[PDB]
Structures are given as C-alpha cells and as structure tokens.
Design a protein that fits this description.
Blueprint lengths: L4 E2 L8 E6 L2 E8 L4 E4 L13 E5 L12 E3 L1 E6 L1 H5 L7 E5 L26 E6 L16 E8 L1 H9 L14 E4 L16 E6 L2 E10 L10 E5 L4 H11 L2
Antiparallel strand pairs: 1-10, 2-3, 2-5, 3-4, 4-8, 5-6, 7-8, 9-10, 9-12, 10-11, 11-14, 12-13, 13-14
The protein binds ligand B3C.
Protein name: Prostasin
EC number: 3.4.21.-
Function: Possesses a trypsin-like cleavage specificity with a preference for poly-basic substrates. Stimulates epithelial sodium channel (ENaC) activity through activating cleavage of the gamma subunits (SCNN1G).
C-alpha cells in the first residue's frame, strides 16, 4: 500500500497474509470460520498447496503476536472463469486445513449480496503488506498498511487507463471489477497487496466490496487500483462455502 499508514492491531481483523514457502505473496480476507477469499492469480498451478500458509490476527508479519494463528490450506478454489478464460474471475476461495476460532483480532468480513451496489465516491479502505511505492518494499517488521480510497466506477476507470495507454496493453476493467483511488495517483494498492480486501462502510458495518487484483505501477497517475467485485461472485461463494464446509 502506497500513501497509507500503519493500521493499529485489531483494526482490520479479517485481513490475512498468504505466504508461499514462508514468503508473503498476497493478502486475503477471512469470510468464515474455515474460508478465506483471495485473488485467483495468487495461486499459480506450479505452486504446491502444502507450501502455503495463512497468517491471521497479526498486524506485523515479522513480529510474534500471541493473537496470531497460522493455518495451512485444505483446498484452493479459483473461480472457473479465471481458469477457463482468464479475463476476469480473479477470485479464489481458500479452505483452511482446520476451522479457526474467532477472537478480538480474527473476525470474518461480511460479504455483499449479488446486487449490492457501492456508489462511486464511497470512501473504502484497502489494506495489505505490499510495496509502499513502486519498487519499494514495506520494511521489517512489516506493519499492516491501510489506505482510504474512494470508489471509482469501472467506466471512469477505463477512461483513465486509456490516457497515454499503449493500444496493445490489456488495461480493460471488466464487468466484475471496480477501481478505487485517485486520478492524481500517489495512494494505491501495490504488489503484494493482491488478494487483500477493499472494505467498504455500509450501514455501520464493513463489507468486502473488492479483492485487490491489478493495476499499473503502484500510485501512478490515471491508474487507480482495480479490484474484483465480491458482489459479482456472491452466489458462487455462498454455494461453495455452504456445500463444502458450511
Ligand atoms: C482477470 C485477471 C487476470 C490476470 C491477473 C494477473 O495480473 C498480474 C498480477 C497483477 C498484480 O501485480 N497485482 C498486485 C496488486 C496490484 C494492485 C494494483 N496496483 C498483487 O499484489 C500482485 N500479484 C502478483 C503476481 C506476481 C508477482 C507480484 C504480484 O503482486 N498484475 C498487474 O497488476 C499488472 C497488470 C497488467 C494486467 C492488466 C489487465 C489484465 C491483467 C494484467 N500491472 C503491473 O505489472 O504494473 C505495471 C508496472 C509498470 C511499470 C513498472 C511496474 C509495474 C499482473 C489479474 C486479473
């Protein structure tokens, strides 16, 4: 996260870190006692399932926390349209090896209904342990960063991505995506934030509106972060979680 600040412990208790062979590769969001939502592209076919871990309840990746729990994965389920076509569906359900017990530091985020709309301009918050500027890592002890970002409609977002774009660069924000950020850049999600939550405030609660998916260089002007919309997958998520491990 570029242009944000460090979250206090417990602030975003659904944020998880997904590591592969012990190295943080992506964020995710706890959504039930045994399921995490993250981005499909975080889970290349080459990678071995048993080498992944999910760390929950920790705000600093390098610091021991008595409130932290770390889990392996029983299953990784990318949405089929990601595997089949690869133009969208950048979302995956991760089933933890064992169900977790919630605490003050580990709580699920509510998912939006299929037709939930989150208005352009809503100030949501993206969180993660990704780069804090293009080509600049978050330093040890790796405190979770948070950043307030207004929602930007996919239509505005496409127009912005088209400014000074190369005609042949895939910069299309699909129907299952939304953007968030600033036209002027400087504040955005960056590499390593992939898969983590865009949390939006609604009726006194927080909902998982988006999953950090892609963008151009972090914080570039005219290139706000792009997120997979959780609403677009609500029926599928609810079906999978309920069928497999309710
Ligand atoms: C539907 C769909 C299909 C395929 C994808 C996968 O796109 C990959 C993962 C994503 C990615 O990097 N997201 C990170 C979160 C970004 C937050 C928004 N900022 C995430 O944390 C992460 N994921 C990583 C994977 C490997 C290594 C490091 C990774 O870090 N990319 C990108 O962001 C590409 C976008 C190109 C693109 C456009 C349309 C479509 C598919 C790809 N942007 C980029 O490389 O930056 C441009 C540049 C110019 C110059 C210098 C540096 C960077 C590529 C996603 C969605």
């Amino acid at each position: 996260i570029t242009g944000g600040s460090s979250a206090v412990a417990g602030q975003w208790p659904w944020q998880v870190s997904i590591t592969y062979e012990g190295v943080h590769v992506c964020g995710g969001s706890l959504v039930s006692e045994q399921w995490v939502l993250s981005a499909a592209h975080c889970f290349p076919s080459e990678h071995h399932k048993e080498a992944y871990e999910v760390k929950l309840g920790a705000h600093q990746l390098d610091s021991y926390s008595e409130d932290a729990k770390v889990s392996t994965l029983k299953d990784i389920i990318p949405h089929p349209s990601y595997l089949q076509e690869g133009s969208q569906g950048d979302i995956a359900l991760l089933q933890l090896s064992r169900p977790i017990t919630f605490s003050r530091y580990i709580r699920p985020i509510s998912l939006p209904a299929a037709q939930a709309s989150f208005p352009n301009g809503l100030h949501c918050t993206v969180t993660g342990w990704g780069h804090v500027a293009p080509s600049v890592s978050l330093l040890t002890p790796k405190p979770l960063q948070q950043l307030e970002v207004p929602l930007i409609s996919r239509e505005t977002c496409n127009s912005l991505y088209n400014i000074d774009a190369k005609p042949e660069e895939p910069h299309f924000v699909q129907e299952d995506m939304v953007c968030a950020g600033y036209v002027e850049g400087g504040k955005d999600a960056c590499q390593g934030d992939s898969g983590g939550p865009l949390s939006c405030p609604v009726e006194g609660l927080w909902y998982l509106t988006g999953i950090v998916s892609w963008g151009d260089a972090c914080g570039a002007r005219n290139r706000p972060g792009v997120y997979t919309l959780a609403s677009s997958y609500a029926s599928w998520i609810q079906s999978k979680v309920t069928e497999l491990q309710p």
